[PDB]
Amino acid sequence: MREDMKDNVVKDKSLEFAVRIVNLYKFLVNEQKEFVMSKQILRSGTSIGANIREAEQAQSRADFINKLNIALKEANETEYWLELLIRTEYITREQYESINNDSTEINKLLISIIKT
Amino acid sequence: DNVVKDKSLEFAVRIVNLYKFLVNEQKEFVMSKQILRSGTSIGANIREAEQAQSRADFINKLNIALKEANETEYWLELLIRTEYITREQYESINNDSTEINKLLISII
Amino acid sequence: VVKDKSLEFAVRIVNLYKFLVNEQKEFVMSKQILRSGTSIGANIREAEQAQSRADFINKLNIALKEANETEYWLELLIRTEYITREQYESINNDSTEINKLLISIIKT
Amino acid sequence: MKDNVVKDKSLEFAVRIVNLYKFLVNEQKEFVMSKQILRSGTSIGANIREAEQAQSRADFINKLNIALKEANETEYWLELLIRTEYITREQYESINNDSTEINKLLISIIKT
Amino acid sequence: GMREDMKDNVVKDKSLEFAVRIVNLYKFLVNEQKEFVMSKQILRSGTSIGANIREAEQSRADFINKLNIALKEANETEYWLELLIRTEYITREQYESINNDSTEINKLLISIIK
Ligand SMILES: [Ca+2]
Ligand SMILES: [Ca+2]
Ligand SMILES: [Ca+2]
Ligand SMILES: [Cl-]
Ligand SMILES: [Cl-]
């Protein structure tokens, strides 16, 4: 993808992802009656976009990169919770692959920006 | 200082009213609770700032208020993208949030 | 004196929490005030066990901070009709009594 | 022997606290003070365990001080529970006796 | 011992596997033993360990802080295991197996931190 766009695209992807994470939370709580892992991943999964939003408001490029690094942290924690959820049969392989692929797409873009 | 005190409490009230709409009418229970916390915590941190015993503490709490404001703005973006609120609701609340941000930044 | 008042106050906050959750279906501000309101007495107890005057005063200042936070939530709760004016004034009078007694210990 | 004694006593007290939690939730339908004392009451032993695994003296004393804080917090919730009549005077004295026994052991060790 | 530079890689892997075991212990406790208190607590502490280890992947200070949180949660988990064996909700076999896995994580974290 065009290098200039990477930040604008990762913002939009993170908002779409937050919405998917909200839906996953509802699924886990309402259908699977799972209250512990669900709360953890609701937080980490929606915090990716929140930190990207802080990054966009940075007063320095330093602060920008740092906020993106916190977004990356949150993406990685979310990936941990997703892996735990598939291994313990709270989500199907289809659910896992779909959501995890969106997560890892965000990882890739954040790393590019950070490393760019 | 008095002004952002009043405005942040008034803003907390509006967030509660938005929360009531979301739970009672839209039957939305996840994002509503998130914005309820972040949006009412802005005034909580401002009040803590008012009572601070040092300048660093004062600025530190006002910075936390600004972080809660940005979180609140984030949840509002998600609520309009997902069509749980109207553009009118979004603009009205965001106008009030912007006013508080400007005040905090001026003070900080 | 303030010790006993803070324990009685913690009981009122526990019962307010139960009212907010079970009757008003409110889970977020209720959680905040449960914490702040019961933390007052917990910190006053910690104060009594402090090994220095500085640590004694620090713990009482934290209790005072928690009292102030409590009062913010109470104000928001009456403004948003989760509690009556009568409930607010009763509970707030008790909370602010604790501010006064703490300040007298710390500063006089 | 205070080290081994406070370990044993804190584990027994933790079990008492789990049983108090069950009583409060199942019989008394009390979900708020119960949750708080479950945390504090079991945190005493948890912190004693961390103290035992401490790599330094500062870490050791820190963790025992946290245990003592958690013992004092447990006694605070116990006071709230007797005040609201969720436990009897006898129940209160019995559980409080065990908590204060731990307080004294912890202080003794910290002051060594 | 293993190479120092592999301890972080291994503790990451082991903590995920351990979180899986803890979830399975939770399911056993609630479904088979009808135990609802310690099970919920250990679920939280035991799954949190690997989450904090993942976070440490993203300052030396902050790195050490996160790993110390993971270590605290490992110890909390090990305390709940102690309570579970003391109260006879798990066998000595289950206790030793799960505890050994948990304490292998403690050892790796301590070494990485020091
Ligand atoms: Ca761009
Ligand atoms: Ca306006
Ligand atoms: Ca490595
Ligand atoms: Cl919902
Ligand atoms: Cl049970």
Kindly list the characteristics that best describe this protein.
homopentamer; 116 residues; 4 helices; binds calcium ion; binds chloride ion; unknown function; structural genomics
Q: What does this protein look like?
A:
The structure is a homopentamer. Chain A has 116 residues and is mainly alpha-helical. In chain A, 83% of the residues lie in helices and 0% in strands. The longest helix of chain A has 27 residues, at 61-87. The first copy, chain A, contains 4 helices and no strands. Chain A has one domain (2-116): de novo design (two linked rop proteins). Chain A binds chain E through residues 36-37, 40, 44, 69-70, 72-73, 76-77, 79-81, 83-84, 87-88, and chain E through 16, 19-20, 23-24, 40, 43-44, 47-48, 50-51, 54-55, 57-58. Chain A: Ca(2+) 1 binds at residues 4, 7-8. Chain A: Ca(2+) 2 binds at residue 102. Chain A: It holds the Pfam family 23S_rRNA_IVP. Chain A: One of its GO terms (molecular function) is metal ion binding. Chain A: It comes from Bacteroides thetaiotaomicron (strain ATCC 29148 / DSM 2079 / JCM 5827 / CCUG 10774 / NCTC 10582 / VPI-5482 / E50).
